[PDB]
Design an enzyme around this catalytic site. Structure first.
Site, PDB file in Angstrom:
ATOM      1  N   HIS A 116       0.860  -1.084   0.142  1.00 33.34           N
ATOM      2  CA  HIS A 116      -0.120   0.114  -0.007  1.00 33.34           C
ATOM      3  C   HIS A 116       0.844   1.318   0.328  1.00 33.34           C
ATOM      4  O   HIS A 116       2.021   1.080   0.248  1.00 33.34           O
ATOM      5  CB  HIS A 116      -0.735   0.060   1.161  1.00 33.34           C
ATOM      6  CG  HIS A 116      -2.085   1.092   1.132  1.00 33.34           C
ATOM      7  ND1 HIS A 116      -2.901   0.969   0.198  1.00 33.34           N
ATOM      8  CD2 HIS A 116      -2.096   2.111   2.273  1.00 33.34           C
ATOM      9  CE1 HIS A 116      -3.792   2.109   0.481  1.00 33.34           C
ATOM     10  NE2 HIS A 116      -3.514   2.621   1.709  1.00 33.34           N
ATOM     11  N   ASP A 133      -4.585   8.537   3.679  1.00 30.05           N
ATOM     12  CA  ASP A 133      -4.604   7.076   3.312  1.00 30.05           C
ATOM     13  C   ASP A 133      -6.136   7.040   2.664  1.00 30.05           C
ATOM     14  O   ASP A 133      -6.959   7.329   3.267  1.00 30.05           O
ATOM     15  CB  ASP A 133      -4.799   6.250   4.496  1.00 30.05           C
ATOM     16  CG  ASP A 133      -4.546   4.640   4.372  1.00 30.05           C
ATOM     17  OD1 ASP A 133      -5.061   4.259   3.337  1.00 30.05           O
ATOM     18  OD2 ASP A 133      -3.892   4.173   4.873  1.00 30.05           O
ATOM     19  N   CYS A 186      -3.852   2.930  -5.034  1.00 27.73           N
ATOM     20  CA  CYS A 186      -3.613   3.519  -3.913  1.00 27.73           C
ATOM     21  C   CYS A 186      -2.478   4.440  -4.191  1.00 27.73           C
ATOM     22  O   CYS A 186      -2.471   5.705  -3.540  1.00 27.73           O
ATOM     23  CB  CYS A 186      -3.245   2.536  -2.673  1.00 27.73           C
ATOM     24  SG  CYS A 186      -1.762   1.354  -3.102  1.00 27.73           S
TER      25      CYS A 186
END
Length: 227
Positions: A116, A133, A186
């Site tokens: 990630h 995030d 991401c």
């Protein structure tokens, strides 16, 4: 509500690079970085941005931050953070040689969490350190790690202490800011968060935008030019 259109002619240029051919073809070369079609491929489809892409993109934000009216930006390379949370100041104090981190308005700190990507942003004007995030997670530590890094860094180079008076460290809520729906996007969200943030615009886009952003990102890197 209105995003730079990718014309059919721009469209074509993307096709020509998303195409079969030597995964060495050197598509772009800048900031000591070299994007080949291998790399450029990680932006294709629902693939997973590699480090080269991301490092290249943050550098174009850095470049863009020169033109006035925009806050100035230093972008740490992507191995700065993971080689901090794991090994601490003395590993990295060397990378900032011939670089003054306090001379700019904003530092961007791409964070690689396993597979990630998220981002941290230092803003000297707002005197705050924020964490982004697109999976709404949190990292109250990452921010402390950075303030600790600033203190330590003002120590080495400036020999001074860093005044933490009025600094605020937080993780962005996961609400308001938009979230991913695809694990592979991401890297994109961290990129696009950083784009908005470096122009001081509100984060406006969503997940439905990411296939547009990827193709666009391909074009931008080919031309080393941000729409």
């Amino acid at each position: 509500d209105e995003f730079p259109e990718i014309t059919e002619e721009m469209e074509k240029e993307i096709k020509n690079v998303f195409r079969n051919g030597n995964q060495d073809e050197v598509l772009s070369e800048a900031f000591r970085l070299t994007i080949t079609r291998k790399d450029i491929q990680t932006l294709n489809h629902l693939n997973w941005l590699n480090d080269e892409i991301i490092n290249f993109y943050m550098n174009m934000l850095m470049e863009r931050s020169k033109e006035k009216g925009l806050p100035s930006v230093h972008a740490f390379n992507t191995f700065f953070f993971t080689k901090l949370k794991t090994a601490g100041y003395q590993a990295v104090k060397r990378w900032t040689k011939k670089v003054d981190v306090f001379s700019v308005d904003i530092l961007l700190v791409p964070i690689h969490l396993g597979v990630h990507w998220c981002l941290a942003v230092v803003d000297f004007r707002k005197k705050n350190i924020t964490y982004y995030d697109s999976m709404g997670g949190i990292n109250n530590e990452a921010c402390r790690i950075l303030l600790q890094y600033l203190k330590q860094e003002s120590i080495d180079k400036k020999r001074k202490e860093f005044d933490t008076n009025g600094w605020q460290l937080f993780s962005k809520k996961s609400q308001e800011i938009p979230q991913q729906m695809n694990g592979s996007d991401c890297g994109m969200f961290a990129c696009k968060y950083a784009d908005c943030i470096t122009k001081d615009r509100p984060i406006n886009f969503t997940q439905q935008h990411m296939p547009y952003f990827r193709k666009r990102m391909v074009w931008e890197i080919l031309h080393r030019k941000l729409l």
